[PDB]
Amino acid sequence: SGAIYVGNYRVVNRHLATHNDWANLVWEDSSRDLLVSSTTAQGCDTIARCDCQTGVYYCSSRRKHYPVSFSKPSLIFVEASEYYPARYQSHLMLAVGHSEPGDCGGILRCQHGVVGIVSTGGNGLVGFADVRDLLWLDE
Ligand SMILES: NC(=O)[C@H]1CCC(=O)N(Cc2noc3ccccc23)C1
Ligand SMILES: [Zn+2]
């Protein structure tokens, strides 16, 4: 679990969005596993606008932050789960690191701000859904 709060927006994994997120929907993309909903309160986070390929993410299944080197956002095959059929997930960044399904929503940050959130993983890998291209989050 986990979300990004920026301005009047809440960014979550689409597969973990609540009834309230869908009732206040701004934008969603099943191919990216992202959903953005509107909030009444001003958010605590700021978004990176950079090409960083190193950062630190929070891993709730270890209660720890880990440093990662990650690939540029790209189209990657993701095996079927209870939430989605087997498909290519877009704007996904891979890295070597521990992650379990409940870790989705953990934030990845670089020196510039929030880069993305945990969305995929397994077998010593962790995948992050990028949010740096979503320029409208800042306005
Ligand atoms: N973006 C997706 O399609 C995810 C939907 C929820 C989900 O369980 N997965 C598969 C999964 N197995 O092991 C993981 C470790 C970390 C994060 C996800 C996973 C993929
Ligand atoms: Zn950066």
From Swiss-Prot:
Entry annotation: catalytic residues: H15 (for protease 2a activity), D33 (for protease 2a activity), C104 (for protease 2a activity)
Coiled-coil annotated spans: none
Binding-site positions, Zn(2+) 1: C50, C52, C110, H112
Catalytic reactions on record: Selective cleavage of Tyr-|-Gly bond in the picornavirus polyprotein
Subunit structure of this chain's protein: Homodimer.
Protein purpose: Cysteine protease that cleaves viral polyprotein and specific host proteins. It is responsible for the autocatalytic cleavage between the P1 and P2 regions, which is the first cleavage occurring in the polyprotein. Also cleaves the host translation initiation factor EIF4G1, in order to shut down the capped cellular mRNA translation. Inhibits the host nucleus-cytoplasm protein and RNA trafficking by cleaving host members of the nuclear pores. Counteracts stress granule formation probably by antagonizing its assembly or promoting its dissassembly.
Name this polypeptide is given: Protease 2A
Parent-protein residues present: 869 to 1007 of 2193
